Design a protein around this ligand. Structure first.
Ligand SMILES: *[C@@H]1O[C@H](CO)[C@@H](O[C@@H]2O[C@H](CO)[C@@H](O[C@@H]3O[C@H](CO)[C@@H](O)[C@H](O[C@H]4O[C@H](CO)[C@@H](O)[C@H](O)[C@@H]4O[C@H]4O[C@H](CO)[C@@H](O)[C@H](O)[C@@H]4O[C@H]4O[C@H](CO)[C@@H](O)[C@H](O[C@H]5O[C@H](CO)[C@@H](O)[C@H](O)[C@H]5O)[C@@H]4O)[C@@H]3O)[C@H](O)[C@H]2NC(C)=O)[C@H](O)[C@H]1NC(C)=O
Ligand SMILES: CCCCCCCC/C=C\CCCCCCCC(=O)O[C@@H](COC(=O)CCCCCCCCCCCCCCC)COP(=O)([O-])OCC[N+](C)(C)C
Ligand SMILES: [Ca+2]
Lengths: 273, 496, 301
């Protein structure tokens, strides 16, 4: 059964102000806005939270029904569109237990899982998969290259009781493996006297908060179509039913806008001479 | 008629020469003999460690010498030792090793400087405030116990800025923080002082959270030099009998006339009283008694003299209006003396709110809060407005007196000889006193500016001259001689 | 105690007998200067670490280039700074102070005087190199003097500026290190001049073209051309960049092409620990979480 731990589409027009709480740890945190962007596939189905102020930190979260993934597959899914093509800026989402105070969130809040693309300079264009395990915020060993263009891209993380995991981008597989292989959770096997197996890595006692905690020099990115669920299937169908259906219209819309801009540029070059 | 109308030019020149000689001597006493007004000594606090010894009984941590505290060289060592906050007590011993404080240091003024290191994830908040848990003690001999003098919480707002780019390449550099006014005591009756400062941390109550990464606490102790105090007391000891003698002479001159004194003579006597109140060295009792209120008392004495001088100038100008004026009733001068009264009252209230409260709490400062700053600025602004009104009134009255004089000069030949001499003497009185007062005020202002801009002393030949102290001695002697000359030259003359 | 201390000149070892307490402070000052020099040049091919053996003042540089000038100036400034700073907190008693008449002289004067009489005694042999080191030491002490932060407080009648007191406080040594780094970036080439009657040079003048005057007392000078510093050669005092870290990018003097002088990079999966996500008190409370990451750092071949 589709145990929907969290889900949002912002079809109500003002639900983001009601379900998402703006943090007040620091005075100069940037403000999200609900906008469809300059270009989109659907005017209201693709209206999401947009960063609006340059060179600002951002801190905003929504609480949901607490749950535990012990003995159950966990799936997190969301979509990002980078209307400004950041040279530096995050696009990842953080998951917190319900003990977190949503008004005091900042860059140093203790999250359970951090997932999503991160960009800063040409050097780093990777997808973060960080697990807070026994006081260690272990980063993923394998390097997953994230998308860069203005088009909307879907990101999905799957964690399974058998310690296996996979990362889905644009409803397509990009990475797979196991928790104990691709992270430095346990001491190395070599038999090392310090070694001891621990299959309970994947399990968290409670998830109760999803948050957006990121720094952006160039504002303009839009987040949409969040999902936290136990079912990989419902994740895949949901991603097809929001990103896939709007993909064609959004692509045609960008193509038309770029054609108009190119026509304007070439006619301006002709008339200037 | 005064003395000065009668005096020939030769006697006036003799008096002026004697006064100039005494003025030069007054300048030289401070320039050559005095060692400089104040001494500032900078103390680096020793980061003592409370190894959970001060649980109930109050304990004193000594920076150095016998019974020296367990201390940290640099505050990073507290992490491997797992020494939490609320245990690091910054301790200062006010007399540096092998030195003693003495009552001849007429006061102790302390400021605080914080060395706050810039760290990217430990920056100072937008409205950070540090609340020091200060404790201060005194001791008379090195083998006795410390006795608690004060124990207060001292909140101060941080005004720190960081100039370098906020990048890890420039991490660890200190914030540029303005100095924090710490405390002031009007008496130094004891020899040794111990100062203990703690910065307790409490996230729930927001005590000392977000004040940055404080590395060192640096204390600066300002006191008046003992040599300057001794020179000052010798000067006052010379001046007190002189002013007393001239006061008694002037009182006898006034009262044994065949007529009651006019208002101007009473105002001159009041100015003499106001200066005699300064000249009496009651501060020479502060070297035997613990009178912490001597700073406020001296400030009130100085303010009384300033108010009486400013009042005397306007009364003199009013009393030298040649035509249809010079009524000997003080009530007619409420318009022009009023600004002096209002400004003096406002400054007195401000001084009571700043130095008067510090008698009960040395670490108090009116500026620690926004409301206190607003109140103090209100009093200071009212005083400044009153001063501007007073100077406008004084300029108008001087112009009017000169207009009246210029209108009088044409009609002099038609008058009788006695009235001619009377009016000529009044004109000479006014012109002489106005020129002398302008010279004294100009020299006072010029030397004040010079002492403010000059580094403090000048080296010429085989001697060094203390300009910042020659200023004090020269101006003090200057106004004592001004009062003496005013009280002698403008005393009534007796006909024969 | 200076019997054990290596590298000290015989006259300096007598100053140890005069002030056994101050020699520890002077050693701390020399080490502070060397630490600041190592920090400022950490990204250069000369990381201020030709010191393969330990002496109080650090191993002397065989070539009197800009690097030697910066080293000498920072060492002298550090010695003076440490003497003054240790005096301010009561670690030295005879420093400064008489007290009840004039209240002692300024601390920085004692610090500078003692640092001068100690450090400048190290230049035993008379030579153009000795002139260069003396000039650099005086430049460092002068730069320390120029950077003293002046402060004043008015405490007159009602607190007005009728009376005020001023004092100078030491600049924290990282600021002085950056100032001397800026001086190093613009040091002037100088040349000794010898009088026939004197048979030995006594002063030096600028070698840079379109100039013939004596260099100013607050300007670092050098008399020899700087080596390459990336091939090890004890004839020229070069340590080499073999095995030194590199960022492997375009920025100057830190990219792996320039740092290794074309020898290429070498990577080994360094796998950092990276303590992060902390909640801080002002000095001493940490509860961070270590965000370990298998990062790569590149070393010169
Ligand atoms: C080799 O030479 C090249 C050539 O020049 C150099 O490459 C340069 O690299 C620097 C460093 O990135 C680039 O400077 C950047 O310039 C931007 C525009 O001027 C700045 O915005 C940017 O500032 C970021 O970095 C500095 C220093 O790292 C930080 O002080 C600053 O706060 C910014 O940090 C955030 O930037 C990104 C925003 O998305 C994040 O990816 C980054 O991790 C950091 O995020 C922090 O803050 C967020 C906000 O809440 C937190 O969520 C983060 O924590 C989370 O993520 C971390 C892991 O990332 C987890 O551990 C944690 O659990 C999570 O909570 C962070 O706390 C820079 O100043 C410069 O442009 C480059 N020049 C080029 C490419 O030419 C460089 O010298 C060398 N390069 C290398 C790779 O060595
Ligand atoms: C306009 C700016 C002009 C600023 C001038 C103010 C400078 C003050 C002169 C020195 C202060 C002084 O000597 O005070 C003495 C008398 O005080 C006087 O008799 C001087 C009165 C000056 C008359 C002001 C007219 C200026 C014209 C317009 C008495 O001082 P004290 O009360 O015994 O204790 C203070 C000792 N201490 C000064 C060392 C702290
Ligand atoms: Ca939407």
């Amino acid at each position: 059964e589709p145990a929907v731990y969290f889900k949002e589409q912002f079809l109500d027009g003002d639900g983001w102000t009601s379900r998402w709480i703006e943090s007040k740890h620091k005075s100069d945190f940037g403000k999200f806005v609900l906008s469809s962007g300059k270009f989109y596939g659907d005017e209201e189905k693709d209206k999401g939270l947009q960063t609006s102020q340059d060179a600002r930190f951002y801190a905003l979260s929504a609480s949901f029904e607490p749950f535990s993934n012990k003995g159950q597959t966990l799936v997190v899914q969301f979509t990002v569109k980078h209307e400004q093509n950041i040279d530096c800026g995050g696009g990842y989402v953080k998951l917190f237990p319900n003990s977190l105070d949503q008004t005091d969130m900042h860059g140093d809040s203790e999250y359970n899982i951090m997932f999503g693309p991160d960009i800063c300079g040409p050097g780093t264009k990777k997808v973060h998969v960080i697990f807070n395990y026994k006081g260690k915020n272990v980063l993923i060993n394998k390097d997953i290259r994230c998308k860069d263009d203005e088009f909307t891209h879907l990101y999905t993380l799957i964690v399974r009781p058998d310690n296996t995991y996979e990362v889905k981008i644009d409803n397509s597989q990009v990475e797979s493996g196991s928790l104990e292989d691709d992270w430095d959770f346990l001491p190395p096997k070599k038999d090392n006297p310090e070694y001891s197996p621990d299959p309970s890595i994947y399990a968290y006692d409670n998830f109760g908060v999803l948050g957006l905690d990121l720094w952006q020099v160039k504002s303009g990115t839009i987040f949409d179509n969040f999902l936290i669920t136990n079912d990989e299937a419902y994740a895949e169908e949901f991603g097809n039913e929001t990103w896939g259906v709007t993909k064609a219209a959004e692509k045609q819309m960008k193509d038309k806008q770029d054609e108009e801009q190119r026509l304007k540029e070439e006619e301006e070059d002709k008339k200037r001479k | 008629g005064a003395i000065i109308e009668n005096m020939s030019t030769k006697k006036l020149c003799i008096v002026g020469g004697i006064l100039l000689v005494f003025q030069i001597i007054a300048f030289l006493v401070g320039g050559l003999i005095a060692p400089g007004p104040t001494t500032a000594v900078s103390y680096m606090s020793v980061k003592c460690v409370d190894a959970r010894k001060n649980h109930h009984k109050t304990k004193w941590f000594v920076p150095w010498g016998p019974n020296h505290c367990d201390k940290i060289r640099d505050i990073e060592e507290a992490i491997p030792r797992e020494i939490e906050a609320n245990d690091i007590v910054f301790s200062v011993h006010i007399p540096l090793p092998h030195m003693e404080m003495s009552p001849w240091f007429q006061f102790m003024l302390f400021i605080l400087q914080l060395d706050i290191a810039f760290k990217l994830n430990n920056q100072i908040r937008e409205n950070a405030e540090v609340s020091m848990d200060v404790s201060l003690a005194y001791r008379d001999d090195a083998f006795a116990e410390w006795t608690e003098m004060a124990h207060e919480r001292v909140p101060r707002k941080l005004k720190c800025t960081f100039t370098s780019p906020k990048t890890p390449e420039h991490e660890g550099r200190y914030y540029e923080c303005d100095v924090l006014p710490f405390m002031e005591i009007g008496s130094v009756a004891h020899k040794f002082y111990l100062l203990n400062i703690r910065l307790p941390v409490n996230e729930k109550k927001k005590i000392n959270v977000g004040i940055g990464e404080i590395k060192d606490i640096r204390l600066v102790g300002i006191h008046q030099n003992g040599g300057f105090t001794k020179v000052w007391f010798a000067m006052k000891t010379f001046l007190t009998p002189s002013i007393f003698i001239i006061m008694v002479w002037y009182w006898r001159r006034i009262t044994m006339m065949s007529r009651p004194p006019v208002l101007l003579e009473k105002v001159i006597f009041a100015l003499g009283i106001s200066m005699t109140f300064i000249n009496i060295p009651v501060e020479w009792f502060s070297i035997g008694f613990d009178w912490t209120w001597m700073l406020l008392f001296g400030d009130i004495r100085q303010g009384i003299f300033y108010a009486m001088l400013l009042s005397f100038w306007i009364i003199f100008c009013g009393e030298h209006m040649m035509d249809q004026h010079e009524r000997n009733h003080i009530a007619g001068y409420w318009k022009q003396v009023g600004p002096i009264a209002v400004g003096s009252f406002c400054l007195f209230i401000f001084d009571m709110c700043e130095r008067g409260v510090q008698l009960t709490n040395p670490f108090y400062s009116i500026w620690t809060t926004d409301i206190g700053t607003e109140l103090a600025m209100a009093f200071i602004i009212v005083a400044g407005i009153c001063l501007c009104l007073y100077f406008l009134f004084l300029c108008f009255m001087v112009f009017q007196v000169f207009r009246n004089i210029s209108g009088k000069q044409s009609s002099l030949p038609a008058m009788s000889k006695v009235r001619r001499l009377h009016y000529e003497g009044l004109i000479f009185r006014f012109k002489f006193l106005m020129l002398i007062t302008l010279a004294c005020a100009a020299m006072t202002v010029i030397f004040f500016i010079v002492s403010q801009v000059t580094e403090g002393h000048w080296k010429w030949g085989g001697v060094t001259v203390q300009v910042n102290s020659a200023f004090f001695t020269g101006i003090y002697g200057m106004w004592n001689l001004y009062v003496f000359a005013l009280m002698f030259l403008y005393a009534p003359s007796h006909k024969n | 105690i200076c019997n054990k201390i290596p590298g000290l000149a015989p006259r300096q070892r007598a100053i140890c007998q005069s002030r056994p307490d101050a020699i520890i402070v002077i050693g701390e000052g020399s080490q502070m200067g060397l630490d600041e020099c190592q920090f400022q040049f950490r990204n250069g091919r000369w990381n201020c670490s030709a010191l393969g053996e330990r002496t109080v003042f650090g191993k002397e540089l065989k070539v009197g280039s800009r690097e030697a000038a910066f080293t000498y100036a920072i060492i002298a400034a550090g010695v003076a700074h440490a003497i003054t700073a240790a005096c301010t907190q009561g670690n030295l008693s005879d420093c400064g102070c008489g007290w009840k008449w004039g209240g002692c002289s300024a601390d920085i004067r004692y610090g500078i005087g003692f640092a001068k009489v100690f450090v400048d005694a190290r230049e035993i042999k008379q030579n153009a190199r000795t002139l260069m080191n003396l000039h650099n030491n005086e430049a460092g002490r002068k730069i320390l003097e120029e950077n003293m932060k002046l402060e004043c407080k008015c405490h007159g009648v009602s607190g007005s500026c009728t009376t005020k007191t001023c004092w100078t406080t030491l600049p924290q040594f990282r600021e002085l290190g950056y100032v001397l780094k800026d001086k190093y970036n613009e040091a002037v080439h100088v040349e000794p001049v010898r009088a026939s009657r004197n048979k030995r040079p006594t002063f030096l003048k600028i070698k840079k073209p379109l100039s013939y005057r004596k260099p100013m007392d607050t300007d670092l000078v050098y008399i020899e051309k700087s080596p390459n510093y990336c091939e090890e050669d004890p004839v020229t005092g070069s340590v080499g960049t073999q095995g030194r870290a590199c960022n492997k990018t375009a920025p100057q003097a830190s990219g792996c092409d320039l740092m290794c002088c074309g020898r290429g990079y070498n990577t080994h999966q360094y796998a950092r620990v990276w303590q992060c996500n902390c909640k801080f008190h002002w000095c001493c409370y940490v509860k961070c979480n270590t965000c370990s990451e298998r990062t790569e750092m590149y070393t010169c071949k």
